[PDB]
Design a protein around this ligand. Structure first.
Ligand SMILES: Nc1nc2c(ncn2[C@@H]2O[C@H](COP(=O)(O)OP(=O)(O)OP(=O)(O)O)[C@@H](O)[C@H]2O)c(=O)[nH]1
Ligand SMILES: [Mg+2]
Lengths: 131, 1023, 200
């Protein structure tokens, strides 16, 4: 095998915000939450389009567990179990291949981190709307 | 669809279709591969599939099809061979031998179908296990003659004999009865002279690299069991250590053979075998230095480059050198002619200890531990190894790994962060490194001090500065505490600490400051002898920890609190006295400033800080002074408590106030922390809050009950209710920790226990299952353990309130409520040990549920439950035995003796509880003994069930013959009767009795087991 | 790009299927559902040598569900033997898995993993675990639950199979993602508690 340089496709983005998080997806066929990944959740703004996406990668394997535009339409809601998590509906996530809809929950270290996430997620929704 | 055709055994088997099913499984994918898998599993499992094997072996063009045919035959041979008419048995042997010959003859098949030939060879060995030598006496003389017929057949014969040795000697225990295993071992022993002659001839004369390699592999297995004269009295050691080390194809297997020899304990008075053990080691090291790499080579680089088999070879070499030297290095230490060989072999070990590979480093470190411990204790040895020891000091110092108290680590993007997980592997490796380094430092304290101080200089002046380098040096410096004289240590520690302090002056930025602070804290916590003799230093160190508690890095703040604890555990005397030139004991100054010192800490670290103050205070032994100190420490939490009690007493709906619940939980956790270090001395603070605390427990309980009723069982997963339940849990933990440590058991009984029982028990019993805290049972178990002997009626209340309703939560399945299940059996255990009379008061229906609950425990796979289950059953039997020839005991046996015997046989014999085998056996032996020792007074059978006055002995044996006959219908009545005859004679002798149960467990997996196998023990009683 | 067959073996209940699923989807399966025979799952990693692919044959550890047993190992190019450090009998069985495995696959890289090191009451301690040494196996303490060392068995295998010790896991490319009916699933996802709220 030869060394392959081929890259992250994040080189034309600015990191608006980064936070440690645990991502879950709702499985409707079971009545349950399944973990999808733990790692850094980043809001990445395309330097050409000014569009903002969430891109989250798992620790160690660096595999992608969330890759979707922060759509203005989306709404962050509390989960009844937690003071440090948001749930929201995603209509087009490509972490695992072709675009699919999910209900995600994202949980943070503290209520303070969950609070900053919301403020940044809504800031990003504004960026995305007005461009 | 069509693939299912092979499952029709009314029709001929279609070989071409089977071949396509097998290629679909191995080479296809997704759903097709999945369906082929399930079909092949059904085909292989059909009771008749073995009848197709010959046909498949003859006509298949797919070697996987043939391999699976051989698995089919293997299962027949292992399980049903005796049931088989001698007709089928001879034809099978003939066609398996015939197949192997075919394959050996076809040069290209022999080269390309290794998998199938090795599996065919294994299948032949299974038949040897059933028929040889009693029904195949010619096997070995024939295999030896046939070896000259063909170089492929000779090579393959070595395979067969290797697998035969494995199956008879390395893997027979537990898969064959004791008698059968002995038969096979005896038979191989009797024919081994012919096999060794063949094996030796091939080694002196053989040719084919692959034949030589197969021969050496079989030699490796024989070396596990064969008589020592074959190893030392033939010329074989000279061959292995010369010719076969030279050629790379034989080198790895040769080293493994020599490693087996090297672990042998040799007869000490035999000077010629000694010389032989020196000589093979001499030859082997000469060959390495000539054919592989000289002593100077950089094995760290070689290993990282990983070319060809280099890593395996370096692992085998470390195993060979550490095995031989741990056994025989004395043979080399006194003759001056062997000194160079001793030191060269140790030098290769030094080069191997530089390799970056943790498992290999642990293998070499385990040897260095063995060596340096011997140098520390044995007269006249350390001087030989002075230069090896020097190099080793450097290797360990430079490869120190992170102690457990060091809470800061570099993440993958170069940031210094708090560690998320404890690493047990690394903490163990740090402890073994420290033990070696300590011995090394005792061996030359001057050389150790000089290496560390000189490394430290290169950190200060920047020349060698890095996080890695300052870390490994600091950890090494901390690890040798205790090895230097008090004088030398004082000079050394002053220098080290002043130098680390000046480093935290250069080296700015969050990352650098966390690294250096971790290293200063680690070093300072490791040297309490120094601190205790130097009050000004101790005082300065604590003040620096209090500084570190304001740092914004949470790892640093965490480490500061743990180091504070670690220092005060050793140094607390110096905090309680008034030192010269101070106006008060330092503990007074600490307590006074606690709000300021702790303002930047998270609640958990604050509780740690209070726990450290509690360690200090408990050093003060006059009661009045200690009590005042405790009062002064508890001032903040007690003021918060008083107001929280007034307030939430006047407004129960506060308990729903997130904030209020967090304040309450923190006050109680603070009390748990101080109680954990103060123990019995905490009493006056517990007394201060106790009444209002248990009233709070009751108010919180009614909130939880209410919320669950108003919002559903899901409320137990909400932040509100979890905050409430945290309050109850911490209250129970506080009481438990205090009772756990109390010295005045009279005040526990007369003051604590009765209000505790009344607050906790009815509340537990009357909540729905999802709202009951398992911690209630945990607290009760402490209560019963400490004070149960004094509160027999309280024990009865406990049982009434938790027993039936807990049993009901955990007796539907093995999974639900895992904590309650664990605490339940802990509590039943302690009650059965300490207050057995509580079980005598149970109404009979509940006593029946108790026996039911013990048997249920023992069907668990959860280890903690099963073990408690078997132990309770044992202790219960003992408790019953202890009572008289009395109605309760006699009724117990009439009602439950057979329940226990059959339940224990059940878990012993099914294939799902193998981990409890020893205790199942112990239980069974004690149950048998009650009958055979005439401990049960009363007939265990009903009136007219059996003749006039039959003994319990003969009745037990009839009950068991019947039980086993129905449970294992494929066994003969004879095998069952011989089995039971053995058991009932062996019930005093655990080792023999367990060999008998294991034999039974072998025989139940097959048909036609030999009933004489159970007389195995009657012949070592004979011999 | 290259595909390597990996066979995963070890006693029932040691966490084989949990560990594979954790790598496949990120989930942590709490329930024990014993595997029957084998299940085969493709698993890929991105490396600085390109993508490498494993077909993971996750085999059954309970004897009644053994299926084809050693028939699964044919053509394997690497293996993981798993045991559970909370259950001594699973480590006692490791020589039995290894024996059966290397009879079919005489020369492949094999990693021994002691799983469930996250559990407080560890029963198989470090000093007992020495089987790998004479057998040239690579050994890791791991936990599928806490993710401790969970990537190391595949990284080590990848380095052996690629014959390159500088192989590393790298970030996969993150393609630009694209530009009423889902309101019920939100109602009920928000009403179901996230697991391990007090672990976390
Ligand atoms: N505490 C803890 N539990 C674990 C860990 N990994 C697995 N488990 C649990 O252990 C059980 C083992 O599950 P499986 O992965 O299905 O077992 P398996 O080895 O595939 O068993 P077979 O398919 O029967 O051979 C499941 O309940 C897991 O939740 C771990 O790292 N830590
Ligand atoms: Mg499984």
């Amino acid at each position: 095998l030869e060394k392959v340089d081929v890259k992250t496709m994040e080189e034309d983005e600015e990191v608006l915000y980064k936070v440690r998080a645990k991502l879950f997806r709702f499985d409707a066929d079971a009545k349950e939450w399944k973990e999808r990944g733990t790692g850094d959740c980043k809001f990445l703004k395309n330097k050409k389009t000014n569009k903002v996406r969430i891109l989250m990668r798992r620790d160690k394997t660096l595999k992608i567990c969330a890759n979707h535009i922060i759509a203005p339409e989306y709404t962050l809601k509390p989960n009844v179990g937690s003071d440090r998590s948001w749930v929201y509906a995603c209509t087009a996530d490509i972490a695992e291949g072709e675009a699919e809809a999910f209900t995600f929950a994202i949980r943070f270290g503290s209520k303070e981190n969950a609070d900053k996430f919301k403020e940044e997620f809504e800031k990003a929704q504004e960026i995305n709307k007005k461009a | 669809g069509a693939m299912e055709g092979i499952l029709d055994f009314s029709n001929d088997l279609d070989i071409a279709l089977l071949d396509q099913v097998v290629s679909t499984f191995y080479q296809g994918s997704g759903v097709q591969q999945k369906q082929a898998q399930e079909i092949l599993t059904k085909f292989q499992d059909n009771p008749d599939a073995w009848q197709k094997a010959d046909q498949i072996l003859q006509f298949s063009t797919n070697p996987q099809s043939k391999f699976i045919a051989l698995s089919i035959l293997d299962k027949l041979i292992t399980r049903k061979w005796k049931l088989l008419p001698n007709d089928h048995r001879i034809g099978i042997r003939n066609f398996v031998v015939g197949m192997i010959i075919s394959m050996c003859q076809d040069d290209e098949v022999f080269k390309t179908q290794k998998n199938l030939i090795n599996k065919s060879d294994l299948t032949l060995v299974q038949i040897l296990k059933q028929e040889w030598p009693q029904n195949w006496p010619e096997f070995i003389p024939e295999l030896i003659g046939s070896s000259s017929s063909s170089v492929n057949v000779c090579e393959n014969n070595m395979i067969v004999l290797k697998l035969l040795s494995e199956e008879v000697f390395d893997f027979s225990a537990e898969q064959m009865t004791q008698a059968k295993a002995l038969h096979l071992k005896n038979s191989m022993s009797k024919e081994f002279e012919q096999i060794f002659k063949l094996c030796f001839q091939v080694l002196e004369q053989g040719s084919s690299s692959s034949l030589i390699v197969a021969t050496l592999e079989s030699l490796l297995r024989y070396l596990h069991w064969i008589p020592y004269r074959y190893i030392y009295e033939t010329n074989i050691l000279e061959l292995l250590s010369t010719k076969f080390m030279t050629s790379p194809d034989t080198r790895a297997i040769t080293l493994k053979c020599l490693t087996e020899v090297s672990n042998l304990k040799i007869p000490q008075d035999n000077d010629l075998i000694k010389r032989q053990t020196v000589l093979f080691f001499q030859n082997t090291l000469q060959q390495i230095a000539t054919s592989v790499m000289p002593v100077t080579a950089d094995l760290k680089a070689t290993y990282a480059n990983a070319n060809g088999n280099d890593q395996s070879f370096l692992q085998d070499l470390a195993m060979f050198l550490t095995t031989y030297l741990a056994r025989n290095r004395a043979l080399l230490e006194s003759d001056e002619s062997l000194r160079e060989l001793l030191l060269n072999a140790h030098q290769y070990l030094i080069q191997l200890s530089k390799i970056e590979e943790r498992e290999l480093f642990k293998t070499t470190l385990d040897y260095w531990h063995n060596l340096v411990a011997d140098l520390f204790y044995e007269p006249l040895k350390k001087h030989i190894y002075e230069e090896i020891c020097s190099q080793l000091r450097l290797v360990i110092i430079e490869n120190m790994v992170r102690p457990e108290e060091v809470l800061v680590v570099e993440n993958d993007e170069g940031e210094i962060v708090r560690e998320f997980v404890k690493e047990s592997d690394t903490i163990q490796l740090y402890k073994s490194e420290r033990e070696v380094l300590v011995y090394l430092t005792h061996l030359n304290v001057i050389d150790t001090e000089e290496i560390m101080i000189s490394k430290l200089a290169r950190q200060i002046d920047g020349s060698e500065w890095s996080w890695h380098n300052i870390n490994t040096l600091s950890w090494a410096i901390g690890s040798i505490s205790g090895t230097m004289s008090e004088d030398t240590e004082k000079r050394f520690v002053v220098t080290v600490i002043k130098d680390l302090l000046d480093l935290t002056v250069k080296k700015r930025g969050k990352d650098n400051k966390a690294v250096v602070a971790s290293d200063i804290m680690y070093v300072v916590g490791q040297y309490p002898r120094f601190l205790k003799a130097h009050w000004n230093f101790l005082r300065t160190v604590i003040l620096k920890l209090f500084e570190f508690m304001h740092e914004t890095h949470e790892g640093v703040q965490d480490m500061a609190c743990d180091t504070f604890i670690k220092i005060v555990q050793k140094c607390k005397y110096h905090f309680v006295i008034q030192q010269p030139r101070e106006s008060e004991p330092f503990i007074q100054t600490i307590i006074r400033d606690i709000q300021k010192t702790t303002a930047d800490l998270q609640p958990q670290q604050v509780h740690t800080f209070y726990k450290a103050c509690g360690i200090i205070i408990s050093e003060e032994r006059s009661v009045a002074e200690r009590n005042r100190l405790l009062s002064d420490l508890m001032q903040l939490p007690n003021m918060a408590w008083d107001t929280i009690v007034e307030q939430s007493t006047a407004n129960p709906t506060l308990l729903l106030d997130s904030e209020t619940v967090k304040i309450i939980a923190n006050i109680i956790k603070t009390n748990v922390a101080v109680c954990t270090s103060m123990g019995a001395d905490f009493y006056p603070q517990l007394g201060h809050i106790y009444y209002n605390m248990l009233q709070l427990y009751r108010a919180v309980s009614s909130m939880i009950s209410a919320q669950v009723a108003a919002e559903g069982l899901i409320a137990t997963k909400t932040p509100k209710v979890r905050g409430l339940r945290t309050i109850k849990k911490e209250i129970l933990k506080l009481v438990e920790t205090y009772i756990s440590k109390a010295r005045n058991l009279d005040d526990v009984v007369k003051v604590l226990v009765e209000p505790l029982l009344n607050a906790v028990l009815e509340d537990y019993m009357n909540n729905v299952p999802d709202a009951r805290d398992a911690e209630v049972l945990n607290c009760m178990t402490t209560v019963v353990e400490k004070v149960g002997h004094m509160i027999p009626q309280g024990v009865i209340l406990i049982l009434q309130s938790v027993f039936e309703c807990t049993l009901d939560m955990i007796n539907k399945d093995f999974t639900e409520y895992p904590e309650h299940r664990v605490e339940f059996y802990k509590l039943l255990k302690v009650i059965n040990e300490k207050s057995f009379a509580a079980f005598l008061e149970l109404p009979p229906a509940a006593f029946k549920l108790f026996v039911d609950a013990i048997c249920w425990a023992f069907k668990h796979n959860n280890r903690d439950v099963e073990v408690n289950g078997l132990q309770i059953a044992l202790d219960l039997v003992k408790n019953i035995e202890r009572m008289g020839n009395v109605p309760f005991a006699n009724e117990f046996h009439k009602n439950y003796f057979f329940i226990f015997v059959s339940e224990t046989f059940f878990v012993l014999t099914d294939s799902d509880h193998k981990s409890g085998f020893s205790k199942q056996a112990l239980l069974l032996m004690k149950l048998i003994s009650l009958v055979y020792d005439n401990k049960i007074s009363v007939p265990l059978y009903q009136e007219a069930e059996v003749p006039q006055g039959t003994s319990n002995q003969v009745y037990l044996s009839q009950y068991l013959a019947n039980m086993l006959s129905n449970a294992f219908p494929h066994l003969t009545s004879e095998q069952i009767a011989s089995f039971l005859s053995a058991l009932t004679k062996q019930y005093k002798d655990l080792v023999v009795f367990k060999g008998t149960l294991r034999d039974f467990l072998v025989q139940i997996k097959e048909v036609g087991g030999d009933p004489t196998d159970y007389l195995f023990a009657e012949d070592k009683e004979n011999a | 790009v290259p595909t390597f067959k990996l066979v995963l073996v070890g006693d029932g209940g040691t966490g084989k299927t949990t560990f594979v699923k954790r790598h496949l989807t990120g989930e942590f399966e709490k329930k024990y559902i014993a595997t029957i025979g084998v299940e085969v799952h493709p698993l890929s990693f991105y490396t600085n040598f390109g993508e490498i692919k494993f077909d993971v044959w996750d085999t059954a550890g309970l004897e009644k569900f053994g299926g084809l047993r050693d028939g699964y190992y044919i053509n394997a190019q690497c293996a993981i033997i798993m045991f559970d450090v909370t259950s001594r009998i699973t480590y006692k069985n490791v020589p039995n898995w290894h024996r059966d495995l290397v009879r079919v696959c005489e020369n492949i890289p094999i990693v021994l993993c002691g799983n469930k090191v996250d559990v407080k009451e560890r029963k198989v301690k470090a000093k007992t675990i020495t089987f790998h040494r004479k057998k040239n196996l690579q050994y890791y303490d791991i936990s599928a639950k806490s993710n401790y060392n969970f990537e190391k068995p595949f990284l080590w295998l990848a380095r052996k199979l690629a014959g390159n010790p500088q192989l590393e896991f790298v970030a996969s490319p993150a393609l630009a993602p694209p530009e009423q009916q889902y309101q019920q699933e939100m109602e009920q996802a928000t009403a179901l508690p996230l697991p391990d709220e007090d672990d976390a």
